[PDB]
Amino acid sequence: PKGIALALGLNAVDPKHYGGWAGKLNACEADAEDMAAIAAERGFAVTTLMTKAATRAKVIDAIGKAAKALGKGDIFMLSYSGHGGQVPDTSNDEPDGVDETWCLFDGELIDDELYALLGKFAAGVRVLVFSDSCHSGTVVKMAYYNIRYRAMPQSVAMRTYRANREFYDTIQQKTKKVDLADVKASILLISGCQDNQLSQDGAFNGAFTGQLLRVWKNGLYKGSYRSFHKAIVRRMPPDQTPNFFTAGTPDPAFLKQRPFTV
Template identity: 95%
Template sequence: MPKGIALALGLNAVDPKHYGGWAGKLNACEADAEDMAAIAAERGFAVTTLMTKAATRAKVIDAIGKAAKALGKGDIFMLSYSGHGGQVPDTSNDEPDGVDETWCLFDGELIDDELYALLGKFAAGVRVLVFSDSCHSGTVVKMAYYNGTTAARSAGPDEGEIRYRAMPQSVAMRTYRANREFYDTIQQKTKKVDLADVKASILLISGCQDNQLSQDGAFNGAFTGQLLRVWKNGLYKGSYRSFHKAIVRRMPPDQTPNFFTAGTPDPAFLKQRPFTV
């Protein structure tokens, strides 16, 4: 019988000691993680949640590594992240745009190269389902536009306040410069993984496109909130692809969730009802 393991990450803040005095406060990331964990538990996954201060680099890397060792052909791993997306300069020269995208964990960023390497440890036949309610913007002009909008709309704790889950460019560069040796060493030591060569079958449904930002919210992030509405407490019966399309239809025009597959193709996986163990 297939086995499922889920890891739900939610960070409403990061440690300013690492991020140059920036705490990156958000409202709804822990709630997102709790809701994704609840879905996974109801669907039969063994669930671990790591919230804000507990969502450290070491704990996240360890949890993914343990899941990779525990799962085999026919099993599934679900990884959900809700928090800030960031960037560091690409010093390993594997990114066309010159930057690596990151997840802002509490005590440091997890670089996309590291995540790919971790996913590369899963055995052939494992289904890997990733949800990322964060920003992965690679466009400085877009980032500058959203930063200005955020500043204008986030002056106080009003109900209509909008926050975006994006580390500001100034903070990203300040954090990198203060920890340059740390991040450069990670990129040098991380084994380069071609996602096409990954043995597991990976499906990523993310909160926005690479040139967009994801909105935070009062109760859930914009993406997670619509995901929950489409899921409708388990009444949804369609496939992953139709699930994604239904979420997209509910989203604002400046935030279009992405549907991305990698690793070994598994058409049967994509046709399954979401969260099927």
């Protein structure tokens, strides 16, 4: 049973693309190394991409390789620590009508592009995703919240879009909204927070990742993914609750395994 892991960490992005914004953070590379370390110790063929290395091309290509390499019975692990972005949805005039994205160094990866990539995996393959990131969401979230968060500021989001109109418009025209519930692979997406919350960027690792490492306790943790998740949220502040989302072909055996089994 072969396992492939992709640890992504970006504590900076190319200001030359994000309208002068560097999206500086200082614990995302640590999160990736820590996740990659756990994956390696679990028997994963790990590949780490740090900031400059975490570009659209490399990330898309890496995930693509995995989708082709592993098959029924294998498991793909994707962890990500970086900013969460939003690109305007020209489908309407709603000011808060946007598409969530991952702020990669090269540019933004639209959630649909990622979702589609995950849909290229085999049928009996387990896909485990850790996303210690968040999104600006709507003005209401901004209202409640207004210590740095892993969310690109709305001003930069729009400025980045304007500075790259043709680029994102093309991306938006290609891939479309995919249904994660209907994909072949059994996906388990554990994110750092809820859609109405923000993810905190600590000084040595994300708030979520830090607690993930604390309950995992260097491999001494005994339990299933559900228990793993419940044990983490128990330690987390009410304003930041990691989420446990499953998509694709249901696999109760997978959700019953130990958090990083291969």
